């Protein structure tokens, strides 16, 4: 269902619909099912309604409302500067241009751009995908999946039990007291980093299968590095404990000491 240069009202039904507003200020109502909505140019109002809907939005096109409705909905800015978005506060704006903004409501997941983005989740379960560029990803509460992809990314799952995929490039992972049970999955990078804001002597390092497990004594908090021992591509090269740094040789010492 494709609009034209007029201000259109386009309404899908119960199936998986593809709605595109074209030019002008459109209203798109996806109905039930897993819809794909694009406002295109103009200032558009975009309602995914029930189902797991997808929104294709240019971060530089300001003045739209993207409303996922019920279900697990994704906003995608990947179709130049990056995007700053917050699912908790409910906005997305052009990096380097806060006045160029869009309203986000009822959206659970976000895909960024090939440029440097900042993607912030909310207290629910979120998937945040930075794609290329040097991105900052913050999960907030709830159980999140963060994908840094290519580039030098900063990942923090925050509270809840999070999966952190830094991707290729030199990635930094944040962890601390109250961060729950997080797992890191590394694919590549000669200088990945973990920064743990625990007191260093709260930390307990252990090998569990082929994983490295880092616990904070006194808490239920644990950071697992998946397949650490299986291959060098899955390792992080520096671990910081508060203001103290440890290398792989140093980590293995701590493990062996137990």
Query: Terminal CA-to-CA distance of the chain, rounded, Å?
Result: 62
Of 84, 71, 142, 155, whose CA–CA distance to 115 is shortest? 84
Q: Is the dihedral of CA 28, 69, 130, 82 positive or negative?
A: positive
Q: Does 67 bind Ca ion (CB under 5 A)?
A: no
181-186 vs 222-225, strand pairing mode: parallel
Please list every residue from 20 through 49 that binds Ca ion, using CB under 5 A: 21-22, 24, 26, 30-31, 33, 35, 39-40, 42, 44, 48-49
195 or 258, CB closer to Ca ion? Answer: 195
Cross-strand pairs, 108: none
Instruction: Please give the order of strands across the beta sheet that includes 222-225.
Output: 18-20, 36-38, 54-56, 74-76, 109-111, 127-129, 145-147, 163-167, 181-186, 222-225, 211-216, 203-208
Site string (197-236) toward Ca ion, x via CB under 5 A: ----------------------------------------
Among 117, 163, 213, 221, binds Ca ion (CB under 5 A): 117
**In this structure, what token pair is assigned to residue 179?**
């961060």
Among 192, 193, 195, 198, binds Ca ion (CB under 5 A): 192
**Which spans of this chain sit near Ca ion (rule: CB under 5 A)?**
3, 8, 12, 17, 21-22, 24, 26, 30-31, 33, 35, 39-40, 42, 44, 48-49, 51, 53, 61, 64, 68-69, 71, 73, 106, 112, 117, 121, 126, 130-131, 133, 135, 139-140, 142, 144, 148-149, 151, 153, 157-158, 160, 162, 166-167, 169, 171, 179-180, 182, 189, 192
């Amino acid at each position: 269902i494709t609009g034209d240069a007029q201000a259109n009202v386009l309404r899908g039904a119960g199936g998986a619909d593809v709605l595109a507003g074209g030019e002008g200020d459109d209203v798109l109502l996806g109905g039930d099912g897993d819809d794909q909505l694009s406002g295109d140019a103009g200032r558009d109002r975009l309602y995914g309604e029930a189902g797991d809907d997808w929104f294709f939005q240019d971060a530089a096109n300001a003045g739209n409302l993207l409303d996922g409705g019920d279900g697990r909905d994704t906003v995608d800015f990947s179709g130049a500067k990056g995007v700053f978005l917050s699912l908790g506060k409910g906005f997305a704006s052009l990096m380097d241009e806060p006045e160029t903004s869009n309203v986000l409501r009822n959206i659970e997941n976000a895909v960024g751009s090939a440029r440097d983005d900042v993607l912030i989740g909310d207290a629910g379960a979120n998937v945040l995908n930075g794609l290329a560029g040097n991105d900052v990803l913050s999960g907030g509460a709830g159980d999140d999946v963060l994908l840094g992809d290519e580039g030098s990314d900063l990942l923090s799952g925050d509270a809840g039990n999070d999966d952190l995929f830094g991707g290729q490039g030199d990635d930094t992972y944040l962890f601390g007291v109250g961060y729950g049970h997080d797992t890191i999955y590394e694919s590549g990078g000669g200088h990945d980093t973990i920064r743990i804001n625990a007191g260093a002597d709260q930390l307990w390092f252990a090998r569990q299968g082929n994983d490295l497990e880092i616990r904070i004594l006194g808490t239920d908090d644990a950071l697992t590095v998946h397949d650490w021992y299986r291959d060098a591509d899955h390792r992080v090269e520096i671990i910081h404990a508060a203001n103290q740094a440890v290398d792989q040789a140093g980590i293995e010492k701590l493990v062996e000491a137990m």
